[PDB]
Design an enzyme around this catalytic site. Structure first.
Site, mmCIF file in Angstrom:
data_model
loop_
_atom_site.group_PDB
_atom_site.id
_atom_site.type_symbol
_atom_site.label_atom_id
_atom_site.label_comp_id
_atom_site.label_asym_id
_atom_site.label_seq_id
_atom_site.Cartn_x
_atom_site.Cartn_y
_atom_site.Cartn_z
ATOM 1 N N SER A 1 30.240 13.908 52.935
ATOM 2 C CA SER A 1 29.251 13.953 51.854
ATOM 3 C C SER A 1 28.624 15.328 51.556
ATOM 4 O O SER A 1 27.908 15.457 50.571
ATOM 5 C CB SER A 1 28.143 12.930 52.085
ATOM 6 O OG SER A 1 28.659 11.607 52.056
ATOM 7 N N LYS B 1 21.925 18.850 53.893
ATOM 8 C CA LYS B 1 22.797 17.720 53.604
ATOM 9 C C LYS B 1 23.661 17.388 54.803
ATOM 10 O O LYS B 1 24.261 18.281 55.386
ATOM 11 C CB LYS B 1 23.707 18.014 52.409
ATOM 12 C CG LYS B 1 24.491 16.795 51.935
ATOM 13 C CD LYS B 1 23.615 15.707 51.340
ATOM 14 C CE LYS B 1 24.408 14.443 51.010
ATOM 15 N NZ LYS B 1 24.576 13.552 52.182
ATOM 16 N N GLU C 1 19.389 17.742 49.171
ATOM 17 C CA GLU C 1 18.079 17.111 49.384
ATOM 18 C C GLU C 1 17.156 18.167 49.960
ATOM 19 O O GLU C 1 17.606 19.091 50.636
ATOM 20 C CB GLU C 1 18.183 15.895 50.306
ATOM 21 C CG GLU C 1 19.041 14.797 49.663
ATOM 22 C CD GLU C 1 19.396 13.678 50.614
ATOM 23 O OE1 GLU C 1 18.623 13.444 51.578
ATOM 24 O OE2 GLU C 1 20.439 13.014 50.376
ATOM 25 N N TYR D 1 21.283 5.616 47.875
ATOM 26 C CA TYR D 1 22.344 6.608 48.121
ATOM 27 C C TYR D 1 23.715 5.991 47.913
ATOM 28 O O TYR D 1 24.012 4.903 48.448
ATOM 29 C CB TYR D 1 22.202 7.133 49.532
ATOM 30 C CG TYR D 1 23.178 8.201 49.911
ATOM 31 C CD1 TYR D 1 22.908 9.549 49.670
ATOM 32 C CD2 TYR D 1 24.337 7.874 50.581
ATOM 33 C CE1 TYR D 1 23.795 10.527 50.059
ATOM 34 C CE2 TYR D 1 25.233 8.843 50.976
ATOM 35 C CZ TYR D 1 24.963 10.166 50.713
ATOM 36 O OH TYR D 1 25.864 11.107 51.176
ATOM 37 N N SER E 1 29.859 13.124 56.532
ATOM 38 C CA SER E 1 30.675 12.454 57.541
ATOM 39 C C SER E 1 31.919 11.834 56.930
ATOM 40 O O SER E 1 31.913 11.413 55.768
ATOM 41 C CB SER E 1 29.877 11.349 58.224
ATOM 42 O OG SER E 1 28.600 11.813 58.628
ATOM 43 N N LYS F 1 29.180 16.519 48.109
ATOM 44 C CA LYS F 1 28.239 16.252 47.013
ATOM 45 C C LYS F 1 27.433 17.479 46.569
ATOM 46 O O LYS F 1 26.959 17.529 45.428
ATOM 47 C CB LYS F 1 27.289 15.111 47.431
ATOM 48 C CG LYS F 1 27.971 13.766 47.623
ATOM 49 C CD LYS F 1 27.002 12.732 48.173
ATOM 50 C CE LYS F 1 27.576 11.314 48.280
ATOM 51 N NZ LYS F 1 28.697 11.139 49.275
#
Ligand SMILES: *[B@@]1([O])O[C]([C]C([O])=O)[C][C][C]1[N]C(=O)[C]C1=[C][C]=[C]S1
Length: 360
Positions: free
Chosen positions: A63, A314, A271, A149, A317, A66
């Site tokens: 992720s 962030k 984030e 999420y 995985s 992202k």
């Protein structure tokens, strides 16, 4: 006032016990400090072949992919090609279900469309079935009220954001983000010629790598080495130094605050929490019982541009890999931790916080 020796000691003293406690075969770590990356490698990339982790070893980001999606989208905004305030249906007219009215590109990008699920169903295998999935989705909440999420959310944002460019997602990413930043060993599809650098992931003793899935590139499919990852973190830490004018704006857009959810803020992929932050705040926020929960949001409208006094981070995985990146622009410090075992997110956050605490 931290010497190379002192930093090397704190990294070894933190990572060595972590790998033991979490059964991690190999890790590559970069610490950004005083304008340069510092690299540390530990253990094995491939146990059976006895290949050590090196600064060229490729890891699955999961992720953390992202963050690339968010920045690529931001770059498209800065070119004038898309707006976060646009209806999703502007970019996918075939999406005629009336539940889609009032859902913005912002909602897709930031997980607030109203309950889009964590994963795109495995039965979705092409665009027609992807359309059927979104057409049959019954929102559980009104748009802009609940963060859940979701790969099914940001994955679609990524796919739609590149439509005006006319390029497939991989080529848009390479042309507009990777090549301008000289991230020349960062891959959505690892070429045969580079496969020798690709680590094996490990789960419960078994070697594993990530499988293809719909919207994989946009949500969890990027592979990279610790050098390209350090340089990615450095570009995001100090975007003012990036030459490409739309890309530097895209980086800023990805670190802007769009929603507050408890003590964290949602960017595009990234984030953020306000700096200073204590370890327990960030560690506890990363527990799956918080991170995967549907939670109410408070809109930041207009969005807040990047706050330098932020913990920006962030987790990423896959079945066999566990990674984490965090940085604090005010202090120009940052860290990359790439591992070939997926171990708990709170453990990643604790180790990273400890190492960065050493640099003040
Ligand atoms: B992504 O890594 O974000 C969440 C986990 C995290 O915080 O790191 C949920 C999973 C996401 N990753 C994927 O969907 C890719 C995977 C493939 C197999 C297991 S996870």
């Amino acid at each position: 006032p931290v010497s190379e020796k002192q930093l090397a000691e704190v990294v070894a003293n933190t990572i060595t016990p972590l790998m033991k406690a979490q059964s991690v075969p190999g890790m590559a770590v970069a610490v950004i400090y005083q304008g340069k990356p510092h690299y540390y490698t530990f253990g094995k990339a491939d146990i059976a072949a006895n290949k050590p982790v090196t600064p060229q070893t490729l890891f699955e980001l999961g992720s953390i992919s992202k963050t690339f999606t968010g920045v690529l989208g931001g770059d498209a905004i800065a070119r004038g090609e898309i707006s976060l305030d646009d209806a999703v249906t502007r970019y996918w007219p075939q999406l005629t279900g009336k539940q889609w009215q009032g859902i913005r590109m912002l909602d897709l990008a930031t997980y607030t469309a109203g309950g889009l699920p964590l994963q795109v169903p495995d039965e979705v295998t092409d665009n027609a079935s992807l359309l059927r999935f979104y057409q049959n989705w019954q929102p559980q909440w009104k748009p802009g009220t609940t963060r859940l999420y979701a790969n099914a959310s940001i994955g679609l944002f990524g796919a739609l954001a590149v439509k005006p460019s006319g390029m497939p997602y991989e080529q848009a990413m390479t042309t507009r983000v990777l090549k301008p930043l000289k991230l020349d060993h960062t891959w959505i599809n690892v070429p045969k010629a580079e496969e020798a650098h690709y680590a094996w992931g490990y789960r419960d003793g078994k070697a594993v790598r990530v499988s293809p899935g719909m919207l994989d590139a946009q949500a969890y499919g990027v592979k990279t080495n610790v050098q390209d990852m350090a340089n990615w973190v450095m570009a995001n830490m100090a975007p003012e130094n990036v030459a490409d004018a739309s890309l530097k704006q895209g980086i800023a857009l990805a670190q802007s605050r769009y929603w507050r959810i408890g003590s964290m803020y949602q960017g595009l992929g990234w984030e953020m929490l306000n700096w200073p932050v204590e370890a327990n705040t960030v560690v506890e926020g990363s527990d799956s019982k918080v991170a995967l929960a549907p939670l109410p949001v408070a809109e930041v409208n207009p969005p807040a541009p990047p706050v330098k006094a932020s913990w920006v981070h962030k987790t990423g995985s896959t079945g066999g890999f566990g990674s984490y990146v965090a940085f604090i622009p005010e202090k120009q410090i940052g860290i990359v931790m790439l591992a070939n075992t997926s171990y708990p997110n709170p453990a990643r956050v604790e180790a990273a916080y400890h190492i960065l605490e050493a640099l003040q």
